[PDB]
């Protein structure tokens, strides 16, 4: 298990919050709070994710990423679990990752109309 | 009626894709090129979506929206619907929308790990 702390804003609570990434070779999870999303690996099949979805656990704290970005996290996982990344390496690019995000939120539409919606 | 015309920046064209919003009363319909997806109004329900989501559309262009963007132009239409917002600021509040596809897009990760990725 290689572990990796991310810093998402959230602008619910209005400041950062750390989303955990446990990297196994069998599986990845992911969680934020008391909430925990998996990926399992398998031979011959894509990964198999748990019900919950990272937008789901996301959205929770108003951060709207683009949808592909759960599918970012399962290739930096998949990279990683045959050797091209070793721990520090997915660290960084898990870490480019989170920096978007955060870049995403920090860009969102500033006028009086949006401000009022999300 | 009236018609928005949004400039998204595409990757994969290297040039700003139009897109057409077109607003009516009972719909609202997006274009980009030859693929046209459709909001439809009802009276006591959400709007009826196409299954093909604007995110969809516009990974076509290589371009990965924050996921609630649709949701944002459903909103945008329902004011302007009910005469919250007129032509001019429905225009102005899409646009800046698009502003922000355009700055995700500008902000995507660019390590080399990620641009052999997407």
Redesign the interface.
């Given at each position: 298990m290689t572990e990796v702390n991310l810093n998402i804003y959230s602008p619910r609570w209005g400041r950062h919050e750390t989303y955990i990434v446990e990297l196994h070779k069998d599986y990845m999870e992911i969680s934020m709070g008391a909430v925990t999303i998996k990926a399992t690996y398998s031979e011959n099949q894509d990964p198999e994710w748990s019900e919950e979805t990272l937008?789901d656990i996301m959205?929770n704290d108003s951060v709207?990423?683009?949808?592909?970005t759960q599918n970012?996290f399962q290739?930096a996982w998949l990279?990683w679990r045959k050797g091209a990344?070793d721990n520090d390496?997915v660290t960084?690019?898990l870490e480019?990752?989170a920096?978007?995000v955060n870049?995403?939120t920090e860009?969102?539409?500033?006028?009086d109309?949006?401000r009022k919606?999300?």
């Open positions: 937008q959205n709207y990423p683009p949808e592909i970012l290739h990279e990344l390496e960084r690019e480019l990752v920096q978007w870049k995403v860009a969102k539409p500033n006028s109309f949006w919606y999300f």
